[PDB]
């Protein structure tokens, strides 16, 4: 069969690295047409929903252990922030054909035996009876579950205990002095004000609630608009209707309320923020139905249970949340220590997310734009509730570990009190018994309650050829999925052991593979590997230089933040966060910077200072920020086209946007590119821009930060990518 072939390469002959590879699809999934009931591209799972680190699965353990490649699945149930965008097919007859033993769902890989009266489960080989219902002008082959690898069903009654819940929100806002002064409260209020209609309300049942918190927990009774402020203070930190209300029936009142709040705490001098108590308050406020507690704060919890200093209460809270289907999201914006490392556990184990805004300050107009844009997109994001996810494997395969934000204790089931749209997840697979078939399969199932009072079950079925050829296993390895695998193992290692241990784990992942390939597969002295794993060494090396794993000094909050982001980022954004897209703008092609409303972007250059001409203009996009680097020797014409002036020392410095320079088509093109890199319908990230000038203190600090993004270069005591490869070669030698 067309088993993907091994394409040997010499890593030393490919420098700079062919970074265009970061954008190629993974190796093909060699499945002949006969194995699929209705052959088509939709008959096997798309890499967008699931990506196996191995697209040619080792037929047995000893071979898996010998490959030294990991077996993991990058799973992402949703592709966009809004469900109306490119949804999978949706079944509605309520018929759900499932195996009696394993419980796997009918899929494109089952085999109909005995005149099509029964089907043999492809996961456990059990013979099952085909319901007469599967044939009621279309036949069973016109059905999605048989035509598509990724499809969805409307769940029957037995898949529900209680009636689908409404999308419930509880904004727990920090109204302490730090919040007032910084403008976080103002910005938070104004944003809610400007997006009440952005919040999902597909069934008109969406419910909201607002808790303002300082040293006491301030509540608000919101009457129905039709029957036209009641602030109920509670200072006893040891201690529903009209508190959690209809966004629709109280639209004007919620608006009236949010408008007054800023004035209420306008002159607050209290510096207390009792997160613990408030959190328990919100818990009881929505626990009877479940929902999201969205915390906005710029002040370290310092009063009541759960206070922190420069705690396990939170972990216990997440355990309780898993009992009442509550998710917690956090927006931490402050110049002071916030202990993202501790607070991020709230979101982490409740399927929520934490967003960190270092040095946030209203005094900086650009700080407002970033916080607002993200907070707005985040609250507008669709999501599920009471969801659970699991992956079933065919005989011999077993899910062993689960990574990402959700709740999982001693099962193979991942609980999502609410399932967001902007995250990714990873499952490690183990091959126990030897596989006997030429194919093995993996099926991910999501039993969910959509934010439209509907019960659904989303299925993702993946089929992979088995092989005994170690060479074939390597030729079908998904480098980006693998990078992601080790990225999660590294986060675990760090978060539970040490940063250094995590570095050791990252570098080892590369050495073992390079060592294995060299000895397990048959010139001068090259560093051998295959084409599909060509970017792996570079990705792991670059990972060791990421702010999340770097050696040396990195502020506590930044670090925790970076770790939290790398662990939940969608593959696409993960690879870019590790290795950045760098654009050479001064010698930009004429197409670039202009429409094809989507703008065309220049081709990315390698992430190295070797290419930064002193007279050039470069734009760096690392998924977190955008750096506009202008060479200290830029010709006045260039400095002009971009900022209006001809003096390069007069340019804007730091966190600032590019000015609108009239009659400069070049300035428009630069603005187009930036705006293009800023729009995503799958994540909420708004990337602030930092303008840096090439070669008073701030300028040095920025050059330093921007420079650190060029992960191919040497930094302090971390070698360059070139040297890294040399080191590895020396290590796998005798």
């Amino acid at each position: 069969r067309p088993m993907n072939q091994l394409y040997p390469i010499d890593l030393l002959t490919e420098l700079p690295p062919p970074i265009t590879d970061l954008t190629l699809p993974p190796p093909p999934l060699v499945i002949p047409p006969e194995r699929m009931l209705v052959p088509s591209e939709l008959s096997n799972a798309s890499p967008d929903y699931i990506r196996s680190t191995l697209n040619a699965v080792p037929k047995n353990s000893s071979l898996l252990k010998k490959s030294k490649l990991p077996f993991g699945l990058v799973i992402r149930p949703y592709q966009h922030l809004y469900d109306d965008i490119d949804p999978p097919p949706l079944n509605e007859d309520g018929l759900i054909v499932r195996c009696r033993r394993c419980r796997s769902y009918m899929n494109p890989f089952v085999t109909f035996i005995e005149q099509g009266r029964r089907w043999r489960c492809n996961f456990c080989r059990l013979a099952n009876d085909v319901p007469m219902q599967m044939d009621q002008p279309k036949s069973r082959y016109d059905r999605n579950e048989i035509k598509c690898a990724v499809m969805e069903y409307m769940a029957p009654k037995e898949y529900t205990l209680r009636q689908p819940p409404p999308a419930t929100y509880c904004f727990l806002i920090d109204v302490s002095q730090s919040s007032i002064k910084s403008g976080l409260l103002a910005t938070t209020i104004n944003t809610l004000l400007q997006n009440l209609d952005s919040i999902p309300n597909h069934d008109e049942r969406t419910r909201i609630s607002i808790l303002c918190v300082d040293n006491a927990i301030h509540y608000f009774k919101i009457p129905l608009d039709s029957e036209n402020i009641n602030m109920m203070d509670i200072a006893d930190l040891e201690e529903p209707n009209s508190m959690v209300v209809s966004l629709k029936a109280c639209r004007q009142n919620i608006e009236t309320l949010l408008t007054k709040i800023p004035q209420i705490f306008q002159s607050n001098l209290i510096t207390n923020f009792a997160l613990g108590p408030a959190l328990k308050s919100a818990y009881h406020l929505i626990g009877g139905v479940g929902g999201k507690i969205i915390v906005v704060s710029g002040t370290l919890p310092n009063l009541g249970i759960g206070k922190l200093q420069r705690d396990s209460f939170y972990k216990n809270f997440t355990i309780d949340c898993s009992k009442v289907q509550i998710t917690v999201d956090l927006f931490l914006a402050s110049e002071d220590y916030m202990d993202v490392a501790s607070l991020s556990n709230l979101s982490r184990f409740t399927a929520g997310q934490t967003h960190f805004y270092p040095g946030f300050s209203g005094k900086n107009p650009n700080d407002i734009v970033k916080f607002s844009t993200e907070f707005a997109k985040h609250i507008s994001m669709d999501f599920c509730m009471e969801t659970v996810m699991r992956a079933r494997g065919s005989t011999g395969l077993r899910m062993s570990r689960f990574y990402g934000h959700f709740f999982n204790r001693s099962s193979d089931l991942c609980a999502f009190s609410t399932m967001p749209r902007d995250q990714s997840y990873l499952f490690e697979v183990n091959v126990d018994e030897s596989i006997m078939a030429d194919y093995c399969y993996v099926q991910v199932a999501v039993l969910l309650s959509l934010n439209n009072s509907q019960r659904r079950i989303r299925i993702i079925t993946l089929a992979m050829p088995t092989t005994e050829s170690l060479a074939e296993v390597y030729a079908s390895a998904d480098q980006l999925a693998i990078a992601s695998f080790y990225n999660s193992k590294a986060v675990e290692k760090a978060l539970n052991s040490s940063l250094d241990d995590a570095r050791v784990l990252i570098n080892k992942s590369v050495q073992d593979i390079l060592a294995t390939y060299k000895k397990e597969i048959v010139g001068g002295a090259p560093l051998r590997l295959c084409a599909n794993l060509r970017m792996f060494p570079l990705l792991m090396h670059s990972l060791t230089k990421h702010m999340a794993f770097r050696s040396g000094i990195v502020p506590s909050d930044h670090r925790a933040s970076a770790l939290n982001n790398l662990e939940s980022l969608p593959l696409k954004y993960l690879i870019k966060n590790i290795y950045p897209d760098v654009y050479s703008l001064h010698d930009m092609a004429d197409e670039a910077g202009l429409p094809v409303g989507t703008i065309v972007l220049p081709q990315p250059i390698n992430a190295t200072s070797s290419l930064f001409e002193r007279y050039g203009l470069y734009l760096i996009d690392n998924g977190n920020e955008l750096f506009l680097w202008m060479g200290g020797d830029a010709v006045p014409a260039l400095v002009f086209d971009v900022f209006g002036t001809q003096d390069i020392f007069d340019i804007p410095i730091g966190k600032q946007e590019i000015p609108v320079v009239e009659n400069s088509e070049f300035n428009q093109r630069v603005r187009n590119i930036i705006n293009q890199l800023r729009n995503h319908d799958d994540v909420i990230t708004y990337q602030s821009l930092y303008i840096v000038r090439g070669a008073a203190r701030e300028v040095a600090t920025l050059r330093l930060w921007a420079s650190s993004t060029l992960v191919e270069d040497k930094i302090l005591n971390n070698e360059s990518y070139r040297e890294f490869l040399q080191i590895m070669k020396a290590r796998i030698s005798k």
Binding site: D336, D557, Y690, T701
Partner: peptide, 10 residues
């Protein structure tokens, strides 16, 4: 921890 958008800020 004094936070700054730039992690390299003194």
């Amino acid at each position: 921890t004094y936070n700054n958008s730039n992690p390299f800020m003194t």
